[PDB]
Symmetry: C2
Subunit: 236 residues, 2 copies
């Protein structure tokens, strides 16, 4: 493959998807951290007009990441980037070679993106009822096989969900959010035990994956979430 520069941010779960994929592929790449509170003026016009992470500059000459060349192809959207790494590295295991398994992989990601992630942000940012979060977690849990990862062998499906389960845990166990203070620890426990014991086992296995743990700085993310969302209950 041609050279890869990844524009990313430790706080951002969509960006961690891209980091996990590159780690699974053992890809050589140059990282560049974007401060989302203080973005470089060059980032939107030169790299990503949406002004978000993650993004990749692919190819072109060897340049510093803050001096991108217009000759590199600019790419964005986390789920596009994960399948891009999978297509660059066909022996990475990010996607099965099997058509049915690939479809089941993407079907799982659709459950994550359409049900679980919106239900989490509704609960976390707005204090919506936990009802939809349980419904979405039960649905995602029902797609899991008895053992292993989303379609057995680790794949893009696990990459898609792991950064969000990790930051849900960080938020809940620290009571960060707009939901009633004190419910957080109860909800994470409920999502990982009893009726949700399979989901709890799934989360354990995700968090133990080397490509996850090597791209997750739990202390940094916890501190960044606490600072950013401290005022959810108190701001007028």
């Amino acid at each position: 493959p041609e050279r890869i520069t990844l524009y990313t941010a430790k706080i951002c779960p969509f960006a961690q998807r891209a980091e996990i994929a590159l780690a699974e592929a053992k890809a050589e790449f140059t990282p560049f951290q974007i401060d989302l509170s203080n973005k470089p003026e060059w980032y939107a016009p030169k790299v990503n007009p949406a002004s978000k992470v993650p993004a990749i500059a692919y190819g072109g000459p060897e340049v510093p990441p803050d001096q991108p060349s217009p000759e590199s192809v600019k790419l964005a959207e986390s789920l596009v980037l994960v399948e891009f790494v999978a297509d660059l590295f066909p022996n990475s295991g990010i996607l099965s070679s099997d058509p049915v398994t690939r479809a089941q992989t993407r079907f799982f990601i659709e459950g994550v993106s359409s049900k679980l992630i919106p239900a989490w942000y509704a609960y976390f940012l707005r204090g919506a009822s936990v009802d939809d979060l349980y419904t979405a977690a039960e649905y995602v849990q029902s797609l899991l096989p008895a053992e292993g990862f989303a379609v057995g062998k680790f794949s893009a499906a696990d990459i898609a969900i792991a950064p969000f389960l990790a930051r849900a845990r960080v938020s809940l166990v620290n009571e960060i959010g707009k939901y009633p203070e004190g419910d957080g620890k109860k909800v994470w426990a409920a999502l990982t035990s009893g009726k949700f014991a399979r989901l709890g086992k799934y989360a354990e296995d995700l968090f133990a994956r080397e490509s996850f743990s090597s791209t997750f700085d739990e202390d940094y993310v916890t501190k960044a979430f606490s600072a950013r969302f401290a005022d959810l209950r108190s701001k007028h």
Copy 2:
């Protein structure tokens, strides 16, 4: 590939996506029309728990589509099915083999799914401002090359959008919707001329594609939409 049975509906743009993909691949398959006004009792427990079209039953023994076998693999979600057909038919052209080109294909689809389709349904069903529909259309148009289809050769990107542009046109030119009566023909003209001339040429090219025209029944869709959505406007 193994045997393919497609559960579909003429009215449904999501299902037309799959039909276009199968036509581009010259795939052998058995269609079955799902009565969306009176869905068969067996459809949700035996084929698709979400009770939506499209769905595919893949493989297993030869069965009547109204008696699906538990041995066939059941698949759903239109964009999953389109990539499934792509993966089954490597000479179909639905996806390029080139990693960058595949990424740009999926990136176009993300703009269609996240901006254009929600803005259309908001205008049609919710009487939202036309502003967001033009904004979303301008973004999609900005991704088009100077000539040709979304990434050059006809691909999953065009498959994703064509059924929705076709039904937006039918709705607008026949004044079906919650927007003020008489605005529709002017909005479709606006979306296909002037600042949207490129998008107008794209729509013309899409609707002339054989896989699109052979899977679109404009008389049926116009009559079906007129009956279904006759009450979006007050009688007073």
